[PDB]
Amino acid sequence: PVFAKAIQKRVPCAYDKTALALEVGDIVKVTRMNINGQWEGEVNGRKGLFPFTHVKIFDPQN
Amino acid sequence: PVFAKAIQKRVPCAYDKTALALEVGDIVKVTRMNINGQWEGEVNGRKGLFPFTHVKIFDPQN
């Protein structure tokens, strides 16, 4: 054991630039599937990857 | 291929339960240091992994 001082802050959170963010209800135009358990899609002007479990397909005009 | 609706919020931030959180100034009991990137230490009761670059080992000499 030895002791040291923390000179720089360090957060245990990582950001995934490739991940599409989702709000419940956001409408997703899924664009590709089977990308290692993810689907690529887009909502509004943003696109990215996400777990398909977070969405459900629906018929565009019910 | 389809349109789906977000049925669950999803955030582009992933959490590393093994990473030791550091605040500038925190005193770190470094318990092990691999010449393999991350060092192991603890601040107060919490132990975890961290990048040596975020700490300065105290030097008895000044």
- Domain regions of chain B by residue span: 1-62
CA atoms within 13 A on the CB side of B41: 25
Instruction: Give φ, ψ of B54 to 5 degrees.
Output: -100, 5
Judged on CB neighbours under 10 Å (0-12, 13-18, 19+), A29 is: middle
A61 touches chain B (CB under 8 A): no
Query: What's the first-to-final CA gap in chain B, in angstroms?
Result: 65
Data resolution in angstroms = 2.5
Three-state SS annotation for B1-62: CEEEEECCCECCEEECCCECCECCCCEEEEEEECCCCEEEEEECCEEEEEEHHHEEECCCCC
Q: Do B57 and A2 touch (CB under 8 A)?
A: yes
- A1-62: CATH topology is SH3 type barrels. (2.30.30)
Å from B36 to nearest chain A CA?
17
- The span from the CA of B8 to the CA of A49, in Å, is 14
Look up residue B39 and give its two tokens. 């060092």
DSSP state of A10: B
Contact A57 B19 (CB under 8 A): no
Distance of alpha carbon B39 from alpha carbon B27, whole angstroms: 14
The residue type of B8 is Q
Q: List, in sequence order, every residue forming a beta bridge with B50; answer none if it has no partner.
A: B39
